Each structure stands twice: as structure tokens, then as C-alpha cells.
Amino acid sequence: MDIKINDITLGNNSPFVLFGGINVLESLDSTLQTCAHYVEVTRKLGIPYIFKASFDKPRSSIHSYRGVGLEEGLKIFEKVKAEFGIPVITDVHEPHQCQPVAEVCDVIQLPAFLARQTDLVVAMAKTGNVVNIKKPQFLSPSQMKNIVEKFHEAGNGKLILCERGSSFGYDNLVVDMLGFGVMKQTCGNLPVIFDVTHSLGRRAQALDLALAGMATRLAGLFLESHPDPKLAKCDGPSALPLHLLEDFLIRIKALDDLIKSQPILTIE
Amino acid sequence: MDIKINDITLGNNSPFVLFGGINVLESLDSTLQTCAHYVEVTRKLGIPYIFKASFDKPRSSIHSYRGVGLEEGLKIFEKVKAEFGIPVITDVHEPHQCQPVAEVCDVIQLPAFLARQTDLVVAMAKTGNVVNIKKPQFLSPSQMKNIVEKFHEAGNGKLILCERGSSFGYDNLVVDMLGFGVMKQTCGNLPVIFDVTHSLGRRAQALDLALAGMATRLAGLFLESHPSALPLHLLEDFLIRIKALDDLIKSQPILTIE
Amino acid sequence: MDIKINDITLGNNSPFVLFGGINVLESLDSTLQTCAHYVEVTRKLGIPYIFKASFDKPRSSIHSYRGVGLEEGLKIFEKVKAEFGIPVITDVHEPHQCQPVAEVCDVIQLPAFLARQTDLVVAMAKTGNVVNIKKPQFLSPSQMKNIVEKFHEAGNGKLILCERGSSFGYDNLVVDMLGFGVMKQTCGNLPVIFDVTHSLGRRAQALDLALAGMATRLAGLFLESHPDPSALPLHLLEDFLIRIKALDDLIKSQPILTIE
Amino acid sequence: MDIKINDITLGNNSPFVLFGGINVLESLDSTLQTCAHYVEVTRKLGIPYIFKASFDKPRSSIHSYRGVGLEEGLKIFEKVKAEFGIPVITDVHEPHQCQPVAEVCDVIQLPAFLARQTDLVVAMAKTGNVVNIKKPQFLSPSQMKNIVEKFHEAGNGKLILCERGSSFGYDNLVVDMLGFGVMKQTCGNLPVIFDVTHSLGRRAQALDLALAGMATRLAGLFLESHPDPSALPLHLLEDFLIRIKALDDLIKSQPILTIE
Ligand SMILES: [Cl-]
Ligand SMILES: [Cl-]
Ligand SMILES: [Cl-]
Ligand SMILES: [Cl-]
Ligand SMILES: [Cl-]
Ligand SMILES: [Cl-]
Ligand SMILES: [Cl-]
Ligand SMILES: [Cl-]
Ligand SMILES: [Cl-]
Ligand SMILES: [Cl-]
Ligand SMILES: [Cl-]
Ligand SMILES: [Cl-]
Questions:
Q1: CA distance A98 to D122
Q2: Judging by beta carbons within 10 Å of its beta carbon (0-12, 13-18, 19+), is residue A61 exposed, middle or buried?
Q3: CA dist., res. B124 & res. B109, Å (int)
Q4: How many angstroms does the Cα of residue C117 sit away from the middle of ligand 11?
Q5: Exposure string (b/e) for C135-166, b if CB count within 10 Å is 16 or more?
Q6: Nearest alpha carbon to residue A177 among A207, A204, A151, A209
Q7: Cα of D137 to ligand 12 centre, how many Å?
Q8: What would you report as the CA-atom Rg of chain D, rounded to the nearest whole angstrom?
Q9: SS3 of C233, please?
Q10: Which Gene Ontology molecular-function terms are recorded (chain A)?
């Protein structure tokens, strides 16, 4: 099943869509600057693109920076849309936020941590917007159908499943490449995308992991990069250096183009 | 570090406290009847007891029973407290709930899935109530120190750490019995309790697992019962065993291996 | 199902048996000295005791110490048995070793890393000796019935199942305390014992872990001790075992409670 | 580091080599028929090829078919080499087997289950043959360096590291795609290959898993087939390999990008 996000076609047998940006909104200028680089690179290479950012980071330490908030975040997203003409994605945290965020933001994201909170799921469903569901590290690929069921019952079937790794002992994640296939098979072939950033604790391996994931035939890649850099723990420890964006994406796109040009081979 | 909950002294070198009750409040009478059974059994045996129940089930299906809700829930807890003269514990899911729930409920519980929601942690901290922190299946015993830090930063140090198992592959949980010690050593010897019910698959294994856990020298046992859950009629036979073991473990000085 | 080892009754509802000793044999004197400490303490407390040691360490690095070897190892074991009149246990690594080792050693042990080696299982089985099966970190409790079936087919039912923890991510073990019961239920209630030593992170945690395991109602406890792989400090042996026994006596004094 | 195996260049930046064959040798006839198909397909597509088979299955249940055995096994291998002029690979289980197996078989394989058995490692190293090290499901990628160090100490540096998945709870494996990079970085960029067959549960997932692995830039792919739970249907080999080769050629055409 494909989903339409404005001009973009999202689906497991379509050219991959980049859901790309930064961990959290810092300011209007930094946002436009970082977004512009993503927009120029994506236009150059011909990759469908949706700008990603959180306006709030609700797990942040008490007196540490957590974002700009809902009011100024939505203002920044409005400007990104007006300036670049692209779709955007952000995450929602309380049921009340859903309708107003859904007015501006084209895709609304269910945090992995809140993935089981029924009122949030219902509230998101009611908006009618495309929804990105982050798969929790503690949930099996087959347990995702229950979240999908819940959304369907609440009357919204435009769902994206986003992989971010699974708990592997203490203080460690592993990405089960077989999980992509299980989610395709058991959730009606909804678009599946890969959050390579949050599957990682360091950036050196980001390309190898991304390429492996995309080799499995996916609707898209979800990725964060540094902005106008805030070094000491501000951008996320696995964020890609922004200047490498082109060199990175050119390889992802070449791989994706190859996989998608070959018909699906059933092994029976 | 010991914590006072009315007359109860809760601590890792104190007689174990039973955090016992049901999954969700359904009706006043049903709650009173089941609570009465716990109260009678625990007073008979001489085990400090705190009655547990949720007033809402925020994660259950659209097509399921989701509880009596806050307003009704608090009324029931008020009645439980007045009738039996015991403390109670419930979970909270939203910052705005904390102050009203904390007016009635002696212990307020941070749900595992919300363990890292800062706004909730702050709102719970501000009540000044004793807090029960549910340890998520995906967090290491070391990572728990970070939640404890948040609470301290928010001005509340009356914290309980509650073990409920850790993720072990897909759809399976294992309880790392070493994690109790790691939490004790790294989180300032705050009270550690064991949620045996949510650690389990089959109820058949509940005594064996509860005894294993309590053998590591813990402040309390957290369990649910039903007339998954322990059958309510077996509560006395079950508690006799836990108490015998707890009393034995606590009668022998901590043997430090070095 | 109980197993008799000379005058010892080993079983999941009998007083726990201590399988205790050292990692590797080094010399006669040192072996007698350490066994003497164990024997003194276990005789005093009234705990059935079986002395454990390897004669070989086949995974050790090339330039590391490996033990005294088979021939010298058996002589030491003969001497240990002669002096103290207790049963002994050692591990075997090759089919040919099984018969001569079994003539001397009361319990022979299948190493975790070789637990699936059919020819080794067959040769151990044929001795008719009591066998201790070390559960591998990568095997589930229900996969152990496959090892048990193998011993049965080869004609030996005097089997002990020995828990030592399970792979938990990279570089960590966790002991699933529920696994004891699953092995009890699906492997015909064979004696289950707990290797607390090879389960462990740092020794400091040995008492807490041993007590947790024994709380589940087990046939025995398996530990190694150090000079004073985090073995127990030898000078703490008595204080340690007083607590294990006290707990084991309490658990065993109460009839099994079926939860239904 | 590259390894020469006859005319084949094996390395993490060379065209991928296929280590392909069957679980176990049953007869010469059946071996030749299956190998013939591999040879034809790999020749047509231009993929370097090494035929794989075990002559023995040391972990099978007692009365399951265990393979033809060493003597008959080496004869079959000799005929494979004579008929097709290709290199071959097989696994060894005892030190005494190593020199005679190494005479015939170009690559000798250390089983996952025996990975830490020092005597076998040493006996394998002394042959001077190319060695495939199977990574155990319970060893971390950084623990592999210790096996490599042993082989280096015992005189052999022609080593291949073979991924086959890691323990993930009970009776489940996961392949950590990051492990390939970690092995390359910490073990001197030795050739790393991927056993998709043993990593798997249902054969339906074989292509996706294999492509994912090879996307990480590897020296080779390791698989079993069968005319027709995990083995690839022999008739799909061409279609399968067309896709692996297309992905491999692309990845290997692009300069390594280090994220800095
Ligand atoms: Cl995110
Ligand atoms: Cl956050
Ligand atoms: Cl998560
Ligand atoms: Cl990482
Ligand atoms: Cl609860
Ligand atoms: Cl719930
Ligand atoms: Cl949880
Ligand atoms: Cl060893
Ligand atoms: Cl093991
Ligand atoms: Cl193999
Ligand atoms: Cl085998
Ligand atoms: Cl293995």
C-alpha cells in the first residue's frame, strides 16, 4: 500500500523517501539553513524529501535544552513549508497537540515511548494526517500489528512503520534486518522506513547500517544530521556531519535504485 | 535509605512490605472485598501492607474496559483508606493528575513506559509524595540512576525502585537477580521492590520467582491477585512462605563478599 | 528423580549437595589443602559435599597453564578419595578419556561448549556413571531435553542438569530463575543444580545469586573458590554455606505449593 | 588483507566469493550433481566459487544420518577438485583430522562449537591452509580477536571470519550488521564472509538477509542449497546470485566513505 504525501509517493516498492533533518529545533535561522542544505542536496540527486525535527524533546534532563515548544515550533514549520515547498514531519506528545500540529505538519509522529498510549493514538488517528509510528526497542515486529489495529479502529489507515533497533542486553541495540520483512507481511504492506540515527550510538557505521537496511526494500530512510553545530551533546551522538549529506545519499540512492529495478524474487 | 509511609518503615534491611491488590478498579464493593482479604491476611501474618490498584488503563485496546477514571477512583481510594486504615498506591500518567491523586494516594507510581517523561517526573516530584518508579524492561539497572537523578533535581528523594523484568529477545522477559544489587549500590540504597506479577508468563511460577527475588534482600514485594495474577484464595499460603524467607534473610547480617 | 552418589542422595527435594572446589588441578598438596577446607566446613555444617576440579583447561591460551593432565589428574583424584572418603567430579573432553576417568571419578561432567557433541555424549553414557550436563549459555531450558534424550538413547539416565546463565546481549550473562522450573517440568524432574560461579559478574554478588537460585528449590549448588572467573573467597566458605543451608532447609521444610 | 585461494582473490574490497554447497556429503553422485549446478551458474555469471560440504555431522541425534565420514569424504572432495578444478572447503573436528583433511581441502573450517578449543586451533594452524573461523552465536565481534590472536600465535594468519548470527533470547538468532565493520576494524581487516544459511529461520528471507549483509562490504557469501528449512532451492541459485552480484558490484565500485 502506497501513501501520498503531497506530490510524494511513499511505498515499499517506490523510490525511497528521505525523512531528514535534526533532532530538535534550535532557532528559525539554524532550521532554514540546515533545511536548505538538505533541500539542495535532495533536489540535486532527485530524492523525495520531508524535513524532520522535534519541537520538544520531553526526555531531556530537567535544566537542559528541550526545544522551542509547540507555538514557536509550528511557526518555524510554517516558514520551512512556505520557503521550500516541502512536506514536514514532527512528533506529538499529548492528545491535545494533535489537531493543531496536524494543521501545519504533514506527517505526525508517534514517539516510540508513547507507542502504546491509546488516547494519543486515537487523537492522532482523528486528525486524518499521515502518521509515522516509531517501533519501540522492546516491541517485536509482530507486536506492531496491534498498534496498526488500534489506528485502523480509530479510523486512520495512512500509517508508516519506522524501525529503530531492538534491545540487545543492557545498553545496546541491534537492528534485525528480518524484522522489515515480518512487518511488511503482517501489517498489510504499509510503508516501512528505517531510522538509522536512533539505531546507533555512534556515527562511524551509519552508512554501512543504512545500506544494509535499504537493501531489504524499504519505503524510506529517517536520518538526522548536525545543524549549525552545537557540539557538547547538543545534536545527538550518532548525527551525520552535514557536509557529508551528499556523499551519503548518493550511495543510498544508487543502492535503492538497483534494488527497486529488480522484480521481487520469492524464495519457495 | 529507609522511607516512612505512615506507620510503615520501608527499607532494604527491614521486614518486607507487601504492595498488593488488583490490576484496575472496577467497583467499590469488589475493591473493598478484595482489599479486605489482603488486609485480613496481612494483619494476621503481621506483614506491612499497601493496597494497589490503577484507576485507568491507558495502554489497553479501544475495545476493552479502561477503569473507573480519576474522579471515581479517588473516591474508592478514600473509602479504602477510611475503612481499613492502610496506605494505598496508584499510577499516574499526566502531569495534571499528580497533585489531585497525591492528595489521596500515599504512594504515586511512575509507569515504566513514561519513565523518562520529564514533565511527569517533575509534577510527581512536586507533590512531595513517596514515588514508586517502575523499571522499564528496556533500561539497565545502571540507567535507573538517571531517573533517580531527575527526581532529586526536581526536589524529591522519597523514591522506590520497582523491578519488573528485562527484555530478552522478542516477546519474553527475564529478571536479572543481580540487578537488585546493582540498583542498591548505585542509587543510594533506596528501597528496592520486586513486581513479580508483571515479570511472569504463567502464574504457576509466581512463588518460585517471588522467593528468588526476596532472597536477594529487598524492601518489598509487588503483586496482583484475582478471585499473571495470583489466585486470591492462595494469598495466605503464598505470604507465609515469603515471610518465612524474608524473616530468615533479614535475621542474618549482610555478608559482604570482598 | 533422585540419584545416589555413594552415601549422598541428590535430588530436587533433598538437602542440597555442594559440588565445590577449584578451577584446575595444580599439585597434589595444594589440592589436598583446599579440599581439606571444604571437607572441614561441610562436615561441620552437615552438608553433603562432592569435590570438583578440572585436570585440563582446553580453552586456555597457548602459553597459559592448562593443568596437570589426565594421568597425573586421576592419581590426585585417587588420593583425594582415599584421604577424605568423598565423591569427586571432573569434566571430560574426548570420548577416549571417558572410560579411564569414570573408573576414578564418581561424577563426570559434559562441558558446556561440547554439550552437543554426540560422540562425547555417547561415550560418557556408556560408562554408566552419574553425569553432570553443563547447560550452554546459548541453549534454552527446553532445548536441554534434546541432550537428555541423547543420553537416554545411549543408555544412561543418571543425569544432572547444571545451570550457568544465558547469553544476554554481548559480554553479559543473565540467569533466568524460571528456567530451573522449566527444566524440572520437561526433563522428568532430574536433579537441577546451580553453577553460581560461571554465572557471575563480580564475586561480590555470589551470595545474593546463590540464595536466589536455591530459593527455587534445587538439588545442589556448584561453586569454585579462590586462593583467598570470580570464585568465592575461601575464608568466607563457612559463612556463605551457613546461609545457603539455612535457606535450603527452610524451603525444603515446606511442601511444594501448586499455584492454581 | 587479501588471501589467495588458487586463482581466487578473497578480500573485503574484492568481488565477493561464493562459498556454496550442501549441509553434508551423502553420496558422490548427489555431490557431483549439486556441485555441477553451482559451477555452471557461477561460471556463467563470473563469480569466484568454492564448493562446501561437511563429511560428518557431530551434533546430530545418534541415529540420524551423520554423513559419509572422513575417508569417503576426502575421496568425494578429490573427485570434485578433479572434475571441476575448483577449490573446496570442509569443517574439521579433531586435531588428528587436520593434516590429512588439509592435504585435500583448500580451506579448512573451525566449527563455531569448537571455536575456543586451543588444540584444534593449533592443529589447524600447523597445516598452513586457509582457515575459516565460524563466529559462535554467543561471542561478540570483539571476542573474535582472541581467536585470531591464537591462530597468529600458532603460526597461521590466512584467516577468514564467518558471521552466522547471535543469540537473541531463547531459540532465536539476530544478525548484527554492525558486527561486520567491528570485525574488520579490530581483526586487521581480515576477509569477512556471511553465512546467510545458518543465520536464518525461513528460507523466504534468504535474499533480503543476504543483500543486507553484502551491502556492508564483505569478502564473501556462505550458503547451502538443496533440491526441493533454511537451504536455498537449487533451481533459484541463478536468480539469487544475479541479485547478489549486482549489489556487490555496485558497493565495490564506490570508494569507501569514512564518516568523520
Ligand atoms: Cl525522532
Ligand atoms: Cl526526548
Ligand atoms: Cl524505544
Ligand atoms: Cl552504535
Ligand atoms: Cl502496576
Ligand atoms: Cl494499561
Ligand atoms: Cl516496560
Ligand atoms: Cl577451558
Ligand atoms: Cl556456554
Ligand atoms: Cl557450516
Ligand atoms: Cl553437526
Ligand atoms: Cl554457535
A1: 65
A2: middle
A3: 9
A4: 8
A5: bbbbbbbeebbebbebbeeeebebbbbbbbbb
A6: A209
A7: 4
A8: 17
A9: coil
A10: 3-deoxy-8-phosphooctulonate synthase activity
Grid coordinates given for B165: 523484568
Closest CA to B257 of C247, C240, C244: C240
CATH of the domain at A192: 3.20.20.70
- φ, ψ for residue D9 (rounded to 5)? -100, 120
Rounded to whole angstroms, the Cα distance separating C63 from B228 reads 53
Nearest by CB to residue D62, choosing from C63, C122, C170, is C122
Asked if C212 and B212 come within 8 Å (Cβ–Cβ), the reply is: yes
Residue type, B111: P
Distance D220 CA to ligand 10 centre (A): 14
Pairing of strands D159-163, D130-134: parallel
Cell of C259: 499455584
Report the alpha-carbon distance of residue B226 to residue B23 in Å, rounded: 9
Q: Is C118 touching D (CB cutoff 8 A)?
A: yes
CA distance D194 to D214: 8
Overall domain count for chain C? 1
Probe site for chain D from A143, A178, A182, A218 (most D CB atoms < 10 A) = A178
Task: Locate C260 and state its grid cell.
Answer: 492454581
User: Could you give the CA distance from residue B70 to residue B54 in angstroms, rounded to a whole number?
Assistant: 9
Kindly provide the resolution of this structure in angstroms, with one decimal.
Answer: 2.2
Experimental method: X-ray
B138 touches chain D (CB under 8 A): no
Q: Is A2 a catalytic residue?
A: no
Asked if residue C231 lies in contact with residue C197, where contact means CB atoms within 8 angstroms, the answer is yes
Q: Which residues in chain A are contacts of D181 at CB distance < 8 A?
A: 204-205, 208
User: What's the domain range around C139?
Assistant: 1-260
Name the CA dihedral angle for C40, C45, C51, C52, rounded to a multiple of 10 degrees. -120
Q: Is A23 a catalytic residue?
A: yes
CA–CA gap between residue D125 and residue A88 (Å, rounded):
58
Report CA torsion sign: C129, C134, C139, C142.
positive
What distance separates the 2 farthest-apart alpha carbons in chain C?
57
Cβ of D242: how many Cβ atoms within 10 Å?
16
Q: Which of C215, C232, C240 has its CB closest to that of B245? A: C215
Enumerate residues 6+ apart whose C-beta is below 8 A from A237.
A201, A202, A203
Alpha carbons A106 and B253: distance in angstroms, whole number: 62
Tell me the DSSP string of chain B.
Answer: --EEETTEEE-TTSPPEEEEEEEE---HHHHHHHHHHHHHHHHHHT--EEEEEES--TTS-SSS---S-HHHHHHHHHHHHHHH---EEEE--SGGGHHHHHHH-SEEEE-GGGTT-HHHHHHHHHH--EEEEE--TTS-TTTHHHHHHHHHHTT---EEEEE--EE-SSS-EE--HHHHHHHHHHTTT--EEEE-GGG-SSGGGHHHHHHHHHTT--SEEEEEEE--PEEGGGHHHHHHHHHHHHHHHHHSPP----
CB D1, CB D148: distance < 8 Å: no
* Rounded Cα gap, residues C18 and C8, in angstroms: 11
d(CA D226, CA B57): 51
Catalytic residue at A195? no
Backbone region of residue B217 per phi and psi (left: phi > 0; alpha: psi in -120 to 50; beta: other values): left
Residue C170 C-alpha to ligand 9 middle, in angstroms?
A: 13
How far does B41 lie from chain D, in Å, by closest CA? 38
